[PDB]
């Protein structure tokens, strides 16, 4: 024979195996392969596509299409907070159900930069400027516009170009973050602000709708697999 002795690890089944198992029906004439358009070889090609964030999720607007509309209108003086939300792609109540939020809910440790994109869906005659900030933590949430412009911001105007890009850079101690809600890794606090009001001429409606999109930059990454907390079943589906 051949002198061999087993190791601790023999006769066990593991989920992440990569061991060659025999076929049950040999010499199987496999049907040919077809060039189908739209091939995915990495889920990161899917995660970097724009998709709409349900921002307005306030007390039963989620049972409707109303949750995607961010309302904005003419103010009295200036400088108010339209919307604002924490940056937790996987543990938020805002970007929880967006495509980036779903894919990161299948993961645990992520890194990389996140793009937001803001289509303006108002009338063709109204203008207005909006401060789109990013405040890294250590301090709280900036309560007025003067505290908001001491972070990474952008001053966006409404013209022919209806959509902006706030490209949130990567400012972090560690390389990777956590998806789950925890204290050691907090990210930043998006807060949108009136740079000016909305000046609109006569015979046009006053209020309008801003949308928000989300995607990932060139250096986005995910590290650990797990199960997502969205699967809530009781019995089998007979």
């Amino acid at each position: 024979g051949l002198p061999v002795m087993n190791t601790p690890g023999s006769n066990q089944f593991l989920t992440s195996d990569d061991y060659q198992s025999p076929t049950a029906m040999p010499q199987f004439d496999v049907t040919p392969e077809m060039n189908i358009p739209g091939e995915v070889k990495n889920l990161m090609e899917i995660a970097e596509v724009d998709s709409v964030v349900p921002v307005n999720n306030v007390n039963e607007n989620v049972n409707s299409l109303e949750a995607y509309r961010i309302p904005v209108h003419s103010v009295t003086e200036t400088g108010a907070q339209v919307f604002g939300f924490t940056l937790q792609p996987g543990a938020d109540t805002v970007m929880e159900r967006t495509l980036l939020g779903e894919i990161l809910n299948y993961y645990a440790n992520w890194s990389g930069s996140i793009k937001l994109t803001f289509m303006y869906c108002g009338s063709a005659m109204a203008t207005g400027k909006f401060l789109l900030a990013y405040s890294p933590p250590g301090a709280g949430v900036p309560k007025n516009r003067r505290e908001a412009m001491l972070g990474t911001h952008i001053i966006w105007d409404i013209g022919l170009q209806s959509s902006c890009v706030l490209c949130v850079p990567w400012i972090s101690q560690t390389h990777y973050r956590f998806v789950s809600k925890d204290i050691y890794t907090d990210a930043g606090f998006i807060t949108c602000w009136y740079q000016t009001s909305i000046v609109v001429p006569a015979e046009v409606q006053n209020q309008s709708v801003i949308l928000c999109f989300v995607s990932a930059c060139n250096d986005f990454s995910v590290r650990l697999l797990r199960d997502s907390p969205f699967v809530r079943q009781t019995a089998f589906y007979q």
């Binding site: 990569d18 061991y19 060659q20 198992s21 025999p22 076929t23 040999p26 010499q27 199987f28 496999v30």
Partner: peptide, 14 residues
């Protein structure tokens, strides 16, 4: 080393 006589026995191309 590729052992079995098919391609459905080859390991996962990870």
């Amino acid at each position: 080393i590729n052992y079995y006589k098919d391609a459905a026995s080859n390991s996962a191309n990870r």
